């Protein structure tokens, strides 16, 4: 379970950097 | 140990996203 939590928090990193990219170029 | 690490990760993620949306609100 803790390993799975590691992968899902990596996914959260991906989502957050994705939103930063979405609103970065404006 | 794993639970508290996940908690600190989650709070820093929400802080980051709050920072980004506050910056982008203009």
From Swiss-Prot, chains A, B:
Plays a dynamic role in flagellar motility. May be necessary for stable assembly of a subset of inner dynein arms or for the binding of these arms to the outer doublet microtubules of the axoneme. Belongs to the inner dynein arm light chain family. It is found in: Cytoplasm, Cytoskeleton, Flagellum axoneme. It comes from Chlamydomonas reinhardtii (Chlamydomonas smithii). The gene is IDA4. This is 28 kDa inner dynein arm light chain, axonemal. The chain holds residues 204 to 229 of 253 of the full protein. Signal peptide: none annotated. It comes from the Eukaryota.
């Amino acid at each position: 379970r803790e390993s799975e939590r590691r992968e899902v928090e990596a996914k959260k990193h991906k989502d957050e950097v994705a939103y930063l990219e979405n609103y970065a170029k404006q």
